[PDB]
């Protein structure tokens, strides 16, 4: 079995944005995906064991929150498997290996519809214009898009934002990265509440919840992507004495008077019995006091919901007469 990219004839390719109300812009924080569609012909000379490749843009990944996933098998309309694929994270490349199917059928053609998301490690900044390129065999297609990230929600001195940055479907946990006071306001008597009681979904907050807090230095700038790839870069100021569970599937973290941004990384579990991943939602609320004499306060909230997309591979060959 050897490379047969030269024996693959790509007849159609397209890169499509997951949503239709923001053309030219990928709202990564709204979970907007990039869909790569490609149709190709497989030369009859191709035999079992031969391989072909498919590439996603180097600024993208198949899955944003996970590193483990299955590449779609290419099956024909009878269910027969034409090829199976594997993914290489180092070069964002998929390799498909043809089965005995190619030695039985002829005039084989196939179509792939592959989902992908912006790779936050490659695109830390908001408004990053990219000329994304996807490839199949020796053919390619390009599309210019701008990556847009979210902004903090603020109310007086209370200001924050958050994003889910991982999901472990085996252990049923999600990771949420929270930016507290990204605007560097003078937030008095700051309290941060993390709640698993959402209006569209939920998570479980209890004594198993893992919370870590980091301080952002005067010389540092949090990435707009809302995802930290190297926490050793930030000062760990975690102190469990300031985190206390609440009476409503929640937890309260006392920050006191602050003027700098902080990062909270939380690992919480979600109900294993859920049948809809989009019902995994975690809410965060930052409270600050705006009047030291009356205690009058203000709150700013943010919430995240898990999102997902799927990929597929279809094909068909003719049984020779």
């Amino acid at each position: 079995g050897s490379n047969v990219n030269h024996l693959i004839k790509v007849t159609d390719q397209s890169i499509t944005e997951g949503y239709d109300d923001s053309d030219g812009i990928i709202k990564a924080h709204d979970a907007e995906n990039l869909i790569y569609d490609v149709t190709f012909e497989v030369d009859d000379k191709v035999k079992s064991g031969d391989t072909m490749t498919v590439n996603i843009d180097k600024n993208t990944v198949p899955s944003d929150l996970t590193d483990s996933f299955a590449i779609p098998k290419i099956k024909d309309n009878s269910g027969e498997i034409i090829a199976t694929g594997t993914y290489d994270n180092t070069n964002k490349q998929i390799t498909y290996t043809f089965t005995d199917y190619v030695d039985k059928y002829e005039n084989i053609k196939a179509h792939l519809k592959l989902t992908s998301y912006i790779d936050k490690s490659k695109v830390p900044n908001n408004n990053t214009k990219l000329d994304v390129e996807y490839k199949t065999a020796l053919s390619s297609v390009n599309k210019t898009i701008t990556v847009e990230y979210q902004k903090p929600n603020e109310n007086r001195t209370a200001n924050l934002q958050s994003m889910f940055t991982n999901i472990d479907t085996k252990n049923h946990t999600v990771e949420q990265t929270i930016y507290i006071n990204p605007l560097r306001y003078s937030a008095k008597e700051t309290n941060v509440n993390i709640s698993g009681n959402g209006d569209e979904g939920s998570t479980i907050i209890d004594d198993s919840t893992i919370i870590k807090v980091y301080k952002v230095g005067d010389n540092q700038n949090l990435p707009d992507s809302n995802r930290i790839y190297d926490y050793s870069e930030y000062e760990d100021v975690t102190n469990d004495d300031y985190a206390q569970l609440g009476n409503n599937n929640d937890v309260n973290i006392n920050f006191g008077n602050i003027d700098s941004p902080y990062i909270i990384k939380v690992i919480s579990k979600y109900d294993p019995n859920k049948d809809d991943y989009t019902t995994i939602q975690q809410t965060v609320t930052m409270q600050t006091t705006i009047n030291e004499y009356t205690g009058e306060f203000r709150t700013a909230s943010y919430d995240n919901t898990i999102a997902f997309s799927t990929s597929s591979g279809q094909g068909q060959g003719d049984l020779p007469p």
Partner: peptide, 11 residues
Amino acid sequence: GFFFSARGHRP
């Protein structure tokens, strides 16, 4: 066979 990401919302 699921590929994950996440959404953000501001109340």
